[PDB]
Symmetry: C2
Subunit: 496 residues, 2 copies
């Protein structure tokens, strides 16, 4: 009655290739297959790894759109992991950003019906009060970083919910390719807390938390229960997740930023790359931040939050906390000043979608030329594209992915450059948990070389991971120079 | 460390709240429970928002080995897949576009350069010599109508696998596929450095003969009664196999026999209206090639059933070619001797029901049909040409040329005629009407031989299932019911000349018509 077992059911077993790690496709030679008992199950060819990846690449260009390619790499994440990851060497800048921001919105909305975030713990908060039992299926050693998005505000679109894993996996997938963190040493997770657009809820095949876009005072301690049951396991792992920047980010960071090693890239990593662009401009301009005053158009959470970033960055070469308000100028949040008659040495741009009919005022006045818009959605801001923005025709780069002007070539600024080197040094030093901590963006200037007057003015070229290694050399110094850590290594640390 | 990853024993979300906790998953799957029909409705709704010209096949192959039971649930609910999703686009896409890609969890490849490891290769999976059925191996030569694809040939067999168990209730647990990599000759594949197969050329010698001879004998040795059949495979090799090894082993050929079956089925479908005994059915063959004679051999093999000698039946057949009807004293008779202008042939032959598997685009002319139309009141046209737009004629004009008094059947899917007096029917005549049920019935009988009579009762069981729109052959939508109707006739014919391991009263086709796509 209770037990039903048979003497006849057989799966026609697959052997030692169902696990993704070291599947390596046909990269097995005759000695390896006949050792692992694959005699006759792989196609009887032999392909070197780099030739095998190219076979996927020539395969990958045969697709036209950018979404069907994500479905193909989704097929190769579960089988032959190294290909999916060592393909990125063949073309990383195009593919890996495309994996992250443009394609996921179409993948998560239209196709995130996959129930295979394998490393993902799609934990609910309604029935599951016991959540640590999930890790029993997954020790404290050999674990470096972990992502746990609540899936509340994706870039293209916020609040889809259960599909937030593809994002958390996307950060991890981009984490390792940029930072070299072993994929075995990272886990992905996303809590279906709700945060559901009624469109997503109305879908019958949603496969997520049912009608539970739930908030209030109960929210934080539910997340706090998870954040304390992670550090109970290991404070030696970076819980690097992505949520909306509005309220939880600072509240969680204020709650756990001192005692634990947690951060978010959007509010912390982005301003670092902005500081790298400021120093990259000051190198050719020769005007330090002391005599350089800034504007913060929009006064957004990340924008006005950068006031503490620029101020504490000026603490190295600049005056006290009161001096920042005199050297910084906020505007455009309530329609301030119904705009700059002085101090224009470094201009930020719109934290708001409003695109601004050019204002050649900064072009005319005496200054070191440095203005950037820094907003992706409208593909415009207080300044137009750099060509029209070059009304004076000096250099300026955009946070929006832009093309060169033409000679007059800049590169796009992205926070993708920061959080690999940020977490890599933490995976190296084993940090338990400031601006002086986060001050690794100066290494981008070490690899920028904007010394050429006209050609290169961007942070760094996208096809190089060696800039992340140079950030590690700047990040590892956080142990001796910046505070608490567990770093004892030599300067080389070639294979961490 | 993800436990319980076997496709057959995984149901995705379908596992209830208890099984998710009892089997040690503890929330890795989302907080939903979906009835397997709801999961199929989700996949169906998901599949449609795509390119759907070969976009789907990418999604299905990952869904194949990620979740085995669902795939047949969604594939059960189909009229599009039976040919478009997995009998054309694999050739169009998967065979060539994804040749540097592998799907070989179940099924295996071997090489003509290594005859030694097969028996060590076959036992890679835990295979009981008892529990197996319908293992398929193809050399990828002449797949459909394109040519050699090398080691891609699995996508055909694995595709046929999807049609076997969804059509004939075979258990994929007891089913395997194979690929005989003997070396391709397509210049592209060899030039392509990223082709995951043998770079050698075709081999046609005693090495090949000893190879297949040392592969078939161990296929039955390691496990007997396994229905060995080769799909879209070299005919000069194919016919050679059946004459050589078919006397003491269970083998059939979809290219040569299942086609010859369904063609037979359509002949009786007209005979129900023609009111004529099949013995005196004089026909003309168009192919005279390697394959067109095979269906002619099966038709002749059934022509004797109603009382025709060997000499009279071949006299009741005229083969035709564009040089002319195959004749005696023609120096190049091409090693076939049932022979002894076309418009002149139909004139005096007066064939009541003529077919052509010869691929010649649109050679049926209004003057040709009229000669048969005037001579015989109800003639049966059969442009069996599989290519969609390379058939011998369009049906709508042929019915209009004979004033609907003629019968048609098409290899490729077609729309109804709609000759404005009355609307007729399709006449789809693929192989899917035959081999799944011939697989299920022979799994029930456990026949050591798949005899001619056994094949004939299958086609003439098809006739009852669809008989007097004016359809000669049934609709593919109602496939799981006709597969039972053909297994009853297979068992009925298995017991003639005592060939069945098993015996039963026949209330247990449904118990061996298993892998009903739902769970529990």
């Amino acid at each position: 009655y209770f037990q039903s077992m048979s003497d006849a059911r057989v799966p026609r077993i697959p052997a030692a290739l169902s696990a993704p790690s070291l599947n390596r496709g046909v990269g097995f030679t005759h000695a390896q297959r006949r050792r692992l008992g694959l005699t006759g199950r792989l196609p009887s060819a032999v392909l070197t790894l780099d030739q095998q990846a190219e076979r996927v690449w020539h395969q990958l260009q045969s697709l036209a759109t950018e979404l069907g390619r994500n479905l193909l790499l989704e097929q190769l994440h579960y089988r032959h992991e190294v290909l999916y990851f060592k393909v990125l060497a063949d073309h990383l800048p195009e593919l890996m950003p495309v994996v992250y921001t443009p394609t996921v919105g179409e993948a998560i909305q239209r196709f995130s019906d996959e129930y295979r975030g394998q490393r993902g713990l799609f934990l609910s908060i309604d029935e599951p009060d016991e959540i640590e039992e999930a890790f029993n299926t997954l020790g404290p050693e050999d674990v470096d970083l972990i992502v746990c998005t609540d899936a509340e505000a994706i870039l293209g679109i916020g609040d889809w919910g259960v599909g937030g894993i593809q994002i958390a996996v996307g950060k991890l997938a981009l984490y390792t390719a940029g930072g070299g963190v072993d994929p075995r040493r990272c886990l992905a997770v996303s809590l279906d807390v709700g945060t559901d657009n009624e469109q997503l809820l109305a879908d019958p095949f949603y496969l997520g938390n049912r009608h539970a876009r739930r908030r209030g005072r109960e929210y934080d301690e539910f997340v706090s229960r998870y954040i304390e049951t992670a550090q109970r396991l290991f404070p030696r792992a970076i819980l690097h997740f992505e949520d909306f920047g509005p309220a939880n980010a600072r509240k969680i960071l204020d709650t756990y930023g001192t005692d634990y090693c947690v951060f978010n890239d959007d509010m912390q990593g982005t301003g670092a790359v902005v500081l790298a662009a400021v120093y990259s401009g000051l190198k050719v301009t020769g005007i330090p931040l002391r005599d350089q005053t800034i504007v913060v158009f929009g006064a957004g959470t990340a924008g006005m939050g950068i006031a503490d970033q620029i101020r504490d960055a000026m603490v190295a070469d600049g005056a006290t906390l009161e001096q920042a308000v005199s050297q910084i100028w906020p505007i455009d949040r309530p329609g301030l000043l119904f705009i700059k008659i002085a101090s224009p040495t470094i201009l930020l741009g719109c934290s708001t979608v409003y695109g601004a009919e050019v204002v050649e005022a900064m072009t005319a006045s005496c200054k070191h030329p440095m203005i950037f818009p820094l907003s992706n959605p409208t593909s415009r801001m207080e300044a137009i594209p750099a060509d029209v923005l070059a009304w004076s025709n000096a250099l300026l780069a955009t946070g929006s992915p832009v093309a060169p002007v033409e000679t007059y070539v800049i590169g796009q600024a992205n926070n993708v450059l920061a959080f690999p080197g940020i977490g890599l040094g933490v995976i190296v030093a084993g940090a338990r948990l400031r601006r002086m901590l986060h001050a690794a963006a100066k290494a981008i200037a070490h690899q920028a070389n904007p010394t050429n007057p006209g050609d290169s003015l961007l942070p760094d070229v996208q096809n190089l991971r060696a800039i992340s290694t140079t950030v590690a050399e700047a990040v590892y110094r956080a142990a001796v120079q910046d505070g608490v850590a567990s770093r004892t290594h030599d300067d080389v640390r070639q294979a961490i």
